[PDB]
C-alpha cells in the first residue's frame, strides 16, 4: 500500500521504491517523440498504431472543455495555442496530456519513474483510482514512456 500526497488539482505523487516487474509486465513503444501517445494507444486499442487518435482526442477535449484544465493553463494560452503546438510532429506528450486524458476518459493515469530499467522510485498520478484500473506508464530518460500492464 502506497501513500499518495496531493500536489495540484487532480494530481498527486508518491515516493516509493519497487521492482516494476513485481507488479507489471512492460510493453515497449516505438522510440520516437510520439511514445507517450503510443503507450496510451496500447492501453486503449491494444496497438500503438492509434497514437494519432490519442493526440486528436486531447486536442478536441481541450477545445470543448478548456475550463476544466488548470494544469494545461499553466503552459498554453487557449485551445488554439495547444492545438497548434501539439499538431507539430516533434511534440512530446507528457503531464499536460495525462491531465486531459484523466478527465476526458474518467480514468486514472500514473507515471512510474524508472531510470535503470529495474526500480521505480516515484509515482505521479492524475485521478483518484488505484493502479489496477489506471493507465500505467513507465517514464524513463529522454522523455520516453513505455506501457505497463498490471499483473
Residue numbers in the entry: 6 to 156
Sentences reproduced from the published study:
Similar to the pattern observed for HAZV and GANV, QYBV vOTU shows the most activity towards K11, though at lower overall levels. Additionally, QYBV vOTU shows a more pronounced difference in the relative preference for K48 versus K63 linkages, with substantially more activity towards K48. In QYBV vOTU, Trp72 packs with Pro85. Additionally, it is in proximity to His79, suggesting potential stacking of the rings. Specifically, direct interactions, or the lack thereof, work in conjunction with the other interactions to complete the structural features. This is most notable in QYBV vOTU, in which Phe14 appears to pack with Pro76. In contrast, the DGKV and QYBV vOTUs possess more polar residues, including asparagine, glutamate, and threonine for DGKV and glutamine and lysine in QYBV. Despite being phylogenetically distant from CCHFV and the other robust vOTU DUBs, QYBV demonstrates substantial Ub activity and possesses Ile130 that could pack with Ub’s Leu8. Further, increasing the hydrophobicity of the pocket in QYBV vOTU was able to enhance Ub-AMC cleavage, boosting activity by 150% and 50% for the Q19V and Q128A mutants, respectively.
One specific mechanism used by nairoviruses is the production of a deubiquitinating enzyme, termed the vOTU, that disrupts the innate immune response. Interestingly, the nairoviral L segment also encodes a viral homologue of the ovarian tumor protease (OTU) at the N-terminus. Instead, the vOTU’s primary function appears to be the reversal of post-translational modifications by ubiquitin (Ub) and the Ub-like protein interferon stimulated gene product 15 (ISG15). Each vOTU possesses a seven-stranded beta sheet as the core feature, with five major alpha helices framing the rest of the structure.
